Amino acid sequence: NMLNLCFDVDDCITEWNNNRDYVNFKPDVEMVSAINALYDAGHTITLYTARGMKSVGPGRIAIDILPSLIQNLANIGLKYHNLLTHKPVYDWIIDDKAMRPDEFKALMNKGEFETFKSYKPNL
């Protein structure tokens, strides 16, 4: 029953700031606590970000984006296993196993996340 979980960073774990002072992006401390609890329990935590794909481009993420992001995540005390970049950008993903951070936090608060059932058509 160990889950394989994928989290956005921006406007999810931290809040976007248009000043783009990335190392100082502000955490949602409730998200950090919840992810850390899941990490401690033995779930796999992957972070996946589109950051930089439009601003510096795919060839520059490694140099120009990753240092400040990784440092931010350390400063806010986030535990995670995997960090993946080059996420594509859509206005919406419609996905049977997707959840927004508000629902995630609500379920974690109630202790209901680990057994929460994903969508099925049930035709």
Binding residues among 54-83 for a copy of itself as defined by CB under 8 A? 57-60, 62-63, 66-67, 70, 81-83
Query: At a CB cut-off of 8 Å and minimum separation 6, what does 13 contact?
Result: 7, 27, 28, 31, 32, 35, 47, 73, 76, 78
Nearest distance from C-beta of residue 56 to a copy of itself, angstroms: 10
CB distance 13 to 47 below 8 Å: yes
Q: Which of Mg ion, a copy of itself, none does 89 bind, CB closer than 5 to 8 A by kind? A: a copy of itself
70 binds, among Mg ion, a copy of itself, none (CB under 5 to 8 A by kind): a copy of itself
Task: State the number of binding residues for a copy of itself (CB under 8 A).
Answer: 50
